[model samples]
Target: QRKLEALIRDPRSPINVESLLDGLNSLVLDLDFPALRKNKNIDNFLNRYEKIVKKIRGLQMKAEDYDVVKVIGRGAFGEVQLVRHKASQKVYAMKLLSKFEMIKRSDSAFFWEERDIMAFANSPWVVQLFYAFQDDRYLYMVMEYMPGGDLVNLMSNYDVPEKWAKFYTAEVVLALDAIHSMGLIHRDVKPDNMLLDKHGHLKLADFGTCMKMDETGMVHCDTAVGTPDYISPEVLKSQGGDGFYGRECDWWSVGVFLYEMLVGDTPFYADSLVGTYSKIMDHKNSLCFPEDAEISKHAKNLICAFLTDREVRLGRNGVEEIRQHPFFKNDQWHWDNIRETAAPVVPELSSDIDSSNFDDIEDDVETFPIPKAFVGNQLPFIGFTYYR
Candidate 1:
């Protein structure tokens, strides 16, 4: 009876609701309230059924529940806002993705993939999504607000100490390990996507470019997707024919990221995208450390190891072997308890809803372009949410 009621109540469920309603009404049979007064068990069951109906109806949350604060970030697809729940007064970063924009590119799955990933990924190094809902114009995602902003904002503006670079790189390694362990490749591994929470610990964001590996732990995606500076050689090789790379591609990105953090620039940069791709593709042992770079010899060794042959990459042996590398091993740190370790750059929180750490962008503009071949509701599964 409960199952029947649940199916009938679910908006997405295609059930014979009127028949089910008649059946449900029949279940309460001549046991009218007056007649069933003495039947406490039956009355309680009826009461529970009514409450379940009410609960299911109440479960659908709307936009009114949150108060939009300010635009914090923007992208080609959507804009992120700092919002406070009206009743709870709790703050959250609300991601409003334009469904119309997604339809234009015929890439509704791009945004949906991120949603699926956050719903799938549950680790300390990945941002946590709380609630998801949608209206005619947008698909809304509520996630934890990371006040420290992104690693790009930090690294681009400072001569990050090697120690801090190592610290941040170690956190990213943990995050990538978690992602690869689950058979997903975070193709876009760069400083911009590496977000630091209020506590200074790193969490990876932007899984829209991430691809899923098959059962054999490999993917045959040949497209060049990530930022030119961080794109791995194998991904660049995809341009020749079929590029079949796996998790090792991420290690290369880690090397570039470490290089950028410690040396203030990428190892293989050029004036143009074509030049950058050339530097990425056929370049041989060109990953160099600047002579004036304020980093240790061991840090150079770590970066060199990652930027080398894919067969001999840092993670080729295994995550543990990479963890036991000289760079991380030299530091007196516990890998498992890094979250508890004091972060080197924790952002100050002015209030519970403070969004000062993130750069202010333009407010959301209305642009819900219906696709020529559009259908109703691209992704109806807005029930997915997470906290930890």
Candidate 2:
């Protein structure tokens, strides 16, 4: 406890106030406090301690702590900026979300969902959340900065090699496996959402479209909500307003992603969005590869297996089935040693704050217009500020 408090009081420490409180709270919750509970004096002392912590936390940190660098990413209602801590000199990504715009678009729930999912995630294969805060105009989330650009950006120059693709896809499988175990489904898993760290290792990012499963361990998102090129056939049907799908839908997206990495183009890409959707549904049973393409039979087989019906899909049973496939089984895969394994293509990051890997993004204020009212005070978002 003293060490945690010392770090929180240290101005140069990279630790955020939220992390200090969360760690202390977790430590207290996990301890055997039965003996203390029996003592009225000790209980009262602890109660006052809790109240004091709460009081201090509300003003502990703010957006002013970080020095804004430049824009790295742009979204419909958010702008992800590269930021550096003034005291610690640590670089991080700060996502500034316009609550007014999100509520206006009826996407407020998804903003909360994104924060909740990132907090729930606890694996190396997924992006880590550092801290989150809010001001009257916007919701702010601080996350790890991946120097390597996202997969889609990398693939824009050249398709990923088969070996690299296998390695990347394996990491994604582990990420999805961890997420599904928590009874959540990544409603939109695509190359654009998969980012690379400095080591070229893949880490799944962007949880804005995630869905939490209910008590029955299933998601009933009746709306089609994923990239058109990689969406599952069942999700396409769900757009009609009555179909339900589960984790298998994510596996289908993986199939499409793998196909793109190997073939250099999406299997269902067409001139128009409607044509793309039509092609996806029409080729639900068969995903054809170019006859002249020199891709391995195992790659083709894995893609075909994953694109099939849920009952017969490669990853339908679990992550094991996907891992055990011949494509991944060709060599002895040390799942735990993936990080130690030499990465396929590490980002050329000259310094911690380097944004060279990422394409230049416009920082026009139109993306994150300041809300007119104080809308960041929703009850459902209480205690949403978190870090690890």
Candidate 3:
């Protein structure tokens, strides 16, 4: 087989073995040759060949690097921080998830489970996770950062027009498409989990709640892990009941987020956690608000698709299909210039703790004894949080 391979490469083979069949014949000669298959060494050689191929492919892959910066936010396994590229100084967000630390907490299943999902999900709308790297203590995910924070601020304060809601929801659907295609379930889907770039493109963040699901959409974990208002009905139920649910639960949460974005309120709640848990068990939220919201008909229809029962939450349409939907008919310019398309109704932050340009000299801490205290009642920026 080696002689045949060399002959083929030499471009002077008499056997004229140059096609797919020829290649397979050569492989058979190397491994499953008439008498070679009977030899134990043949299987060993085949295994070695497989390993060499894997090593070749591994070597072909190039890993990218980025610079690290100050801590921004935190979760169970680790914390998220702003990232800067060493070369271009382009900024993004990075989450440093420590595997050792998770094991110490006696509840590392979520962290342990999602390593595979993060690897699979490589999409644009989803917070772009460049790749994962492990040091002595932690695994780092260099992801796309939305300087604009999550959608809660936008939904609560930023008055989204019908067109904008459609645009944002469509982006979420795109993230869902990528996640579903990768065969992993994003168990948590909420506005708070969404990060908006300066341009307002929605990047799905927080894969902490993702899990592997069978075709039935049921995850094996007994613990319920997701934001309260956005949890699907199945998740809020007994683990026994939820074990039969599948990936569609994520669409349920998408519906909730879309509804909240349009109307500024959640569907069902009994106040206390236990009370909310009870309500979810019964699956009682059909129409918490007007089905006919103040938005356009197309926007309302898109939201309607998401707010249905888990059985048919979203049809076959995921991200790409949803992006092409009619609701976003007039939103091209908004999508293109996401960075400064819609000027913030709120002021910009200088420091994480301080509103740099948002306040007057008297309002800022340098002049005042109590800093945020002087940020009273009226928000300087229109369409932003009115937290005085």
Candidate 4:
């Protein structure tokens, strides 16, 4: 009993408690303890033990409980699928990450942190995580399904009007504020990570590159982790030395996103990665609009404020600094109840599982064989299973 308790409590232990409990129940049921059943104390203990077993069974979630409907998104690690819970009949987006891939690339794989952020984030701007569980080969994160797809798709299909840009930019600000308040930095803040709900409200997703900040609200990352075009200057600078950057990097990304939304393209875009980096490093000269482009001064000023040097960035003090800007000061923009307002683009859905908002891709997953040495080794993914 002590050994079982220790195995259950230890995160490092790879023992599957649910399977072990099943074995234990089978072994006890097979025993012929005729006299032990008559004692009042033994009966009471048995009742308590049965209750505990039932509770544990209820908490043990399995991937089989969900039926995969379609492949919604895919990444290097794994793919995201639309799934429906058998019991509740509710749809969700299930993210499956390969265990072998995560364990092989241990340093860059942030499976646990991604799960933690989604599991604990309570803000409306962040996606909600319902359950996280792992099997022998993969880890699963069942999250709320956003039928409206992502900002990237929306931007690609239509030229976002200034009104829609202001709406989404404000929501992105609130989302970053929620993450920053949690003492974490969302290194990747591009449009691809900004998912829209059925009502077109934005919710931040994909925390694979997120990092916790120190007491001074600074993070020292040796490598640039975000998309090249949206990557902040300070993040690139940190790669050159032991320098650190704070939440200003996210604000910089917001500036880039806003620029793309208003100008039809990113300001520092280039054909090559190096070319993009050079343009970003020299943003003062390279950050210009097309000769015939038309944009409001207030919007341009806000973008300039966000794309400036980190020391004087618009959100250096806090979200309040960005909130007080002239662009968002109009009577049409409501910060108090922005989520309640009608969005600029509400996704059209034929049914609950409608995925027309997202691009269709082949529903095939590339599987990598676990190396012989690391086979059956699950220590690296300890404490990954979560329930909510």
Candidate 1 lDDT tens digits, 154-200: 87657798778778999999999998887788988998898889888
CA lDDT, candidate 4, residue 376: 31
- Cα RMSD (Å) between model 2 and the true structure? 9.7
lDDT of each: 0.75, 0.76, 0.57, 0.82
lDDT of 2 at 99: 62
lDDT of 2 by residue, 1-388 (tens): 6788788655334355554554444333322156445657646656767666556545656788999998989887878999998888899998988765765687766765577666656678778877777654567888889889898888887756787888888888888888888788898899888989988888888888888887876777668888888888888898788776788999999988898889988888889999898888777644677887778989989998888777788876778778878787535347778777887787777788898878898644333333343223243333445645
Predicted structure 4: lDDT: 0.82
lDDT of 3 at 130: 52
Most TM-score-accurate candidate? 4
Of the candidates numbered 2 and 3, which has the greater TM-score value? 2
- Pick out the ten consecutive residues of candidate 4 with the lowest summed lDDT: 24-33
* Model 3, C-alpha of 233: deviation from truth (Å): 1.2
By the TM-score metric, which is better: model 1 or model 3?
1
The prediction achieving the highest lDDT against the true structure is 4
Instruction: Give lDDT tens digits, candidate 4, residues 1-388.
Output: 6788788765334455533554434333322144554656655666667666556646678788999998998887789999999999999999988876775666525865687778778789889898877665688899999999999999999987888888999999999999999999998999999999989999999998899999889988788788999998999888887878899999999999999998898899889999999999998777987766688889989999999899999988878889978888655658999899888888889999999999996854334453322233455554666656
Ranking by lDDT: 4, 2, 1, 3
Q: If scored against the real structure, what TM-score would every candidate get?
A: 0.80, 0.80, 0.60, 0.83
Q: Report the C-alpha lDDT of model 3 over 1-388, residue by residue, as the tens digit.
A: 6777776454223333323322332343335333454567766776566565445424421224565555667655677767676666667666776545554565544543344444344555666555444432455666656676677766766767666666676667767767876667788888877776655566777777777667654566666767777777667663554355567778788777777777767765557877665665555454556655565667667666766666656543345445555776764544444433553333355643331211122211011122221222111111110000
